Amino acid sequence: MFNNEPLEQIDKELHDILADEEKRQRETINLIASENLTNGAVRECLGNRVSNKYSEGYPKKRYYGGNDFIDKIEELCQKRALEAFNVSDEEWGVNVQPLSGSAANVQALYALVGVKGKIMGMHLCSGGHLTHGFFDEKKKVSITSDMFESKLYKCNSQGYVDLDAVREMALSFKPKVIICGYTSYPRDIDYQQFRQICDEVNAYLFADISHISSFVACNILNNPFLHADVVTTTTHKILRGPRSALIFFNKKRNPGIEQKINSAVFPSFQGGPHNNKIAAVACQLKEVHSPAFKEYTQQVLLNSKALAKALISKQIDLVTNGTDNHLIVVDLRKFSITGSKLQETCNAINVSLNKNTIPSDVDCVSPSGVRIGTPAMTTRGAKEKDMEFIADVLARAIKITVDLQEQYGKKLVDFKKGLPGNAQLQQLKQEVVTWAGALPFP
Amino acid sequence: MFNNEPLEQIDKELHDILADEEKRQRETINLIASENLTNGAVRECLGNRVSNKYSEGYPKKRYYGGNDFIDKIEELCQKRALEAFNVSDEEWGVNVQPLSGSAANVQALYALVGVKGKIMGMHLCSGGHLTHGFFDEKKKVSITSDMFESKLYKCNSQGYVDLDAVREMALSFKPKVIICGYTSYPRDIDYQQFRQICDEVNAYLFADISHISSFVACNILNNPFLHADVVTTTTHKILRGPRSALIFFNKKRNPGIEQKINSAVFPSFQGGPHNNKIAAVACQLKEVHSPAFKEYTQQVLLNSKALAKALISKQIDLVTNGTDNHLIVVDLRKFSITGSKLQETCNAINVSLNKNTIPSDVDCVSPSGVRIGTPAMTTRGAKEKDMEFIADVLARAIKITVDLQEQYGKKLVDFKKGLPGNAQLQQLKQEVVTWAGALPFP
Ligand SMILES: Cc1ccccc1-c1cc(C(F)(F)F)cc([C@@]2(C(C)C)C(C#N)=C(N)Oc3n[nH]c(C)c32)c1
Ligand SMILES: Cc1ccccc1-c1cc(C(F)(F)F)cc([C@@]2(C(C)C)C(C#N)=C(N)Oc3n[nH]c(C)c32)c1
Ligand SMILES: Cc1ncc(COP(=O)(O)O)c(CNCC(=O)O)c1O
Ligand SMILES: Cc1ncc(COP(=O)(O)O)c(CNCC(=O)O)c1O
Numbered sequence: 012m013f014n015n016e017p018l019e020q021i022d023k024e025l026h027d028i029l030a031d032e033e034k035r036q037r038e039t040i041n042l043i044a045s046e047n048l049t050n051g052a053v054r055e056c057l058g059n060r061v062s063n064k065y066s067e068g069y070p071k072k073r074y075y076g077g078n079d080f081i082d083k084i085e086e087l088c089q090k091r092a093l094e095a096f097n098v099s100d101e102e103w104g105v106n107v108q109p110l111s112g113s114a115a116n117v118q119a120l121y122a123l124v125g126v127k128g129k130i131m132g133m134h135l136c137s138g139g140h141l142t143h144g145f146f147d148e149k150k151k152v153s154i155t156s157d158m159f160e161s162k163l164y165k166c167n168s169q170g171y172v173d174l175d176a177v178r179e180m181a182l183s184f185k186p187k188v189i190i191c192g193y194t195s196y197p198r199d200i201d202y203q204q205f206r207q208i209c210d211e212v213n214a215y216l217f218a219d220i221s222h223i224s225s226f227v228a229c230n231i232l233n234n235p236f237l238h239a240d241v242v243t244t245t246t247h248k249i250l251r252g253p254r255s256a257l258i259f260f261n262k263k264r265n266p267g268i269e270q271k272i273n274s275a276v277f278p279s280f281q282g283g284p285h286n287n288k289i290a291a292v293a294c295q296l297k298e299v300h301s302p303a304f305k306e307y308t309q310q311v312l313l314n315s316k317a318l319a320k321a322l323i324s325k326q327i328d329l330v331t332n333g334t335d336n337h338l339i340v341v342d343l344r345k346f347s348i349t350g351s352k353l354q355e356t357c358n359a360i361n362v363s364l365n366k367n368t369i370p371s372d373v374d375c376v377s378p379s380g381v382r383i384g385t386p387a388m389t390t391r392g393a394k395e396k397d398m399e400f401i402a403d404v405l406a407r408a409i410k411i412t413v414d415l416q417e418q419y420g421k422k423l424v425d426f427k428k429g430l431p432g433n434a435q436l437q438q439l440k441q442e443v444v445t446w447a448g449a450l451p452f453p
Numbered sequence: 454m455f456n457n458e459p460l461e462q463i464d465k466e467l468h469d470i471l472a473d474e475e476k477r478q479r480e481t482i483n484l485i486a487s488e489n490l491t492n493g494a495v496r497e498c499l500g501n502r503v504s505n506k507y508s509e510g511y512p513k514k515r516y517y518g519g520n521d522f523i524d525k526i527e528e529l530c531q532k533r534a535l536e537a538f539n540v541s542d543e544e545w546g547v548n549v550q551p552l553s554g555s556a557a558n559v560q561a562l563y564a565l566v567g568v569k570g571k572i573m574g575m576h577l578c579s580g581g582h583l584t585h586g587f588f589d590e591k592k593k594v595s596i597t598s599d600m601f602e603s604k605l606y607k608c609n610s611q612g613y614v615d616l617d618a619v620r621e622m623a624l625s626f627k628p629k630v631i632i633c634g635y636t637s638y639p640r641d642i643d644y645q646q647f648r649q650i651c652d653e654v655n656a657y658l659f660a661d662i663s664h665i666s667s668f669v670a671c672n673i674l675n676n677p678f679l680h681a682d683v684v685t686t687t688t689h690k691i692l693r694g695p696r697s698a699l700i701f702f703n704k705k706r707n708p709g710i711e712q713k714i715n716s717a718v719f720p721s722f723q724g725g726p727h728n729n730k731i732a733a734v735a736c737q738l739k740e741v742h743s744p745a746f747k748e749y750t751q752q753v754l755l756n757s758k759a760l761a762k763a764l765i766s767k768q769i770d771l772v773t774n775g776t777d778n779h780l781i782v783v784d785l786r787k788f789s790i791t792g793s794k795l796q797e798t799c800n801a802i803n804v805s806l807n808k809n810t811i812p813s814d815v816d817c818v819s820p821s822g823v824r825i826g827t828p829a830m831t832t833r834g835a836k837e838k839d840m841e842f843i844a845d846v847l848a849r850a851i852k853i854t855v856d857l858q859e860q861y862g863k864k865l866v867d868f869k870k871g872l873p874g875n876a877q878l879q880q881l882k883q884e885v886v887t888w889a890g891a892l893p894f895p
């Protein structure tokens with residue numbers, strides 16, 4: 012007693028937008044540092060009937076029977092996660108149930124410290140995530156700043172983590188967790204150094220590697236597994252998986268953490284796992300382990316360096332004047348145009364990037380930059396030679412933005428009126444579209 | 454630079470288990486009250502490239518641009534949700550970003566009362582959800598018991614909500630919110646009488662209708678919208694959508710609740726929404742509104758009535774001696790067997806049901822019943838006449854379970870040994886498989 016008509020027939024209204032979304036993805040130069048493109052295999056999993064099943068609990072300790080095939084899929088995913096991040100299944104545990112990154116971080120933090128618990132993370136302005144204890148004078152913006160007591164550590168005026176300030180803070184604050192690994196940070200992390208500060212106060216070390224996961228797994232960048240009690244990561248960014256999260260816990264350093272973390276995920280915070288996610292994650296984790304995927308990850312940093320170099324060659328300033336990873340942050344103060352202005356201009360030319368704060372911005376009211384990343388375009392087959400063109404399109408967009416701000420004035424309302432119908436934007440869009448539309452598209 | 458090889462070729466190991474999973478679903482008599490089977494159109498959305506997009510925030514106020522098509526999908530879903538539940542968009546608002554039921558409830562409760570806030574809900578033992586404040590002497594099992602201060606009310610010895618006890622509690626406890634709507638409650642709710650108690654103590658009225666959603670939408674059962682400040686529902690159960698949740702809030706009764714709920718979902722708890730979920734939900738919400746779906750929902754209650762009656766005719770006791778909805782809870786005290794025992798037996802015969810507590814059970818350690826529901830089987834095409842057979846299979850399973858307990862004893866380990874190889878079970882299974890495999894399968 013159901014309607015099995017195909018999506019096109021069943022919902023022509025929704026099917027049209029999705030074809031449109033597909034086309035806009037197909038014709039966009041996507042510089043969002045957190046985005047990527049999933050293959051058909053990962054999307055077959057997300058559409059799989061395995062999402063029908065309720066399977067609260069863990070494998071072999073399931074509330075319901077008839078979870079025979081779900082247990083195999085959940086354990087195959089845990090196995091591949093541990094393998095991919097080069098961890099022994101004797102020494103490291105993994106939870107694959109968190110629905111997304113923010114959920115995983117809140118669950119993992121609660122496990123360690125509980126309500127009223129003390130945490131330290133990077134400020135959102137300085138590169139840290141919302142789930143790293145972010146708050147404001149007006150409000151406790153994240154639950155992580157409200158259900159926990161959190162303190163926030165800034166990066167220096169050059170845009171690097173200042174360990175002296177972290178320790179200065181850690182000794183007076185005495186937290187149970189110190190969070191490292193960030194949302195918009197263009198350099199590698201000194202986890203070893205972090206591990207030393209946590210011991211000095213007996214705090215837990217929490218490494219959120221969602222933006223840099225593929226680097227860590229493929230050993231291009233520092234390994235937080237060597238020092239961290241917990242490693243959280245999303246699966247949908249550089250890893251190129253579905254939207255989900257992973258929590259890693261070091262049993263050897265902390266016996267009894269496995270149950271503490273597993274109970275935090277369920278039944279403290281979630282109900283039934285989403286099984287299509289789990290299957291999809293397993294499917295991507297097979298791909299992560301191959302030497303082919305390391306080739307892809309290498310390519311992301313190659314492109315990111317070439318992009319950074321090419322932007323400096325056009326006299327554009329970068330936070331920390333370069334990058335060790337997939338991402339860059341452009342400091343736009345040189346041109347006296349805000350980040351949101353450039354985001355609007357870039358969308359008009361089908362360039363997806365996002366506005367981003369910089370060290371000089373005391374206040375989040377106006378982000379003075381934009382953040383860009385190479386994983387999505389690396390996925391679409393772009394090589395080092397392609398980066399000069401991207402740098403060129405970005406340079407042209409900044410210039411156009413300066414022109415439109417001059418012509419229509421600095422107010423954002425005023426600026427936006429200038430955007431529609433601009434001949435140069437339409438010319439730039441066309442140029443963007445022709446080049447983007449041609450590239451391989453999973 | 455990606456692998457577009459199909460799932461079967463790319464990951465033969467995973468494809469085998471999913472092919473097995475598909476076969477088990479196809480040949481199982483699924484009585485799980487919370488399960489259903491999604492159609493192909495809902496699964497196409499779940500597999501759509503729309504999940505590639507990061508779109509934090511709300512429509513027309515995204516952090517990022519290039520969310521034009523995403524904004525249409527997110528607004529099309531909210532509209533259809535308000536349409537489907539017969540609420541005017543001026544009086545009622547809805548948030549469509551919660552990833553699942555448990556996340557939605559925690560988020561709504563936080564919005565209403567904050568950390569240390571006071572809540573009341575039904576005890577887990579009596580039919581309440583984990584996210585309704587559930588705790589135990591040994592541990593605060595849910596975050597709802599830990600991040601909030603919760604009080605738990607029980608149903609009477611006949612298995613009915615005791616409103617005197619709710620008021621007895623509410624006046625002494627003085628909560629800011631009172632939850633009603635339950636996980637395993639076989640009767641309808643007097644939402645009106647809840648409002649009367651809520652107004653008396655100036656507490657909010659929270660109705661969690663996840664199990665009964667379709668009934669509420671199609672006006673077959675009491676409409677909580679007339680009395681409630683907040684309504685939460687999952688989309689994956691009787692509503693037959695993907696795994697997601699909806700939060701409804703009443704603007705007229707509480708202006709400025711909209712921002713409170715919306716800020717709670719993001720950025721307080723979640724990060725990027727899962728757009729494939731929202732797309733998937735939009736697709737099911739269109740179907741919810743058709744009169745064909747009312748036909749199906751009506752059929753679910755007919756099958757449930759017929760099932761309760763056929764079970765009473767075989768001298769099987771039902772909690773409350775019947776049902777007003779999709780679910781029945783069987784009291785197995787008559788046969789001196791446990792619900793856990795009966796769950797094993799039923800999985801051995803490809804009958805999916807779950808163990809469930811009853812009013813007499815002091816503790817959830819040994820639940821004395823099982824819970825069944827008709828939505829899945831109703832979806833597969835089963836009619837009233839088909840119920841006698843399902844009631845026949847359940848009686849036979851209860852009988853076999855008594856025999857195996859006689860032969861191998863009451864210890865659970867001892868009992869399970871009896872399960873493999875049993876001729877009657879193998880006989881009962883084939884009977885189940887032959888009948889189940891024939892039915893329409895979306
Ligand atoms: C300040 C604030 C308060 C409440 C909700 C969101 C934000 C916010 C604002 C911005 C801004 F540029 F100012 F617009 C940027 C961000 C970033 C970036 C990546 C867009 C950000 C940054 N800078 C970091 N570190 O992390 C994130 N997590 N999610 C989002 C969306 C963000 C967040
Ligand atoms: C007691 C306990 C502590 C910690 C985690 C889970 C449970 C639990 C136990 C049972 C059992 F006793 F075994 F039948 C059942 C349940 C139910 C049913 C529907 C399986 C239940 C019930 N009775 C309610 N009301 O709600 C739920 N939400 N999630 C689960 C899984 C449940 C929960
Ligand atoms: C370090 C970090 N941690 C956690 C999350 C949470 O992910 P979910 O959106 O899945 O909750 C993000 C998202 N990062 C947003 C961005 O960089 O664009 C992140 O950057
Ligand atoms: C009343 C109620 N509320 C919230 C949830 C949470 O749903 P998620 O699993 O999507 O977190 C459930 C799940 N119901 C469990 C069952 O009936 O089997 C529920 O019954």
Ligand SMILES: [Cl-]
Nearest residue numbers: 057287288730
């Ligand atoms: Cl999903």
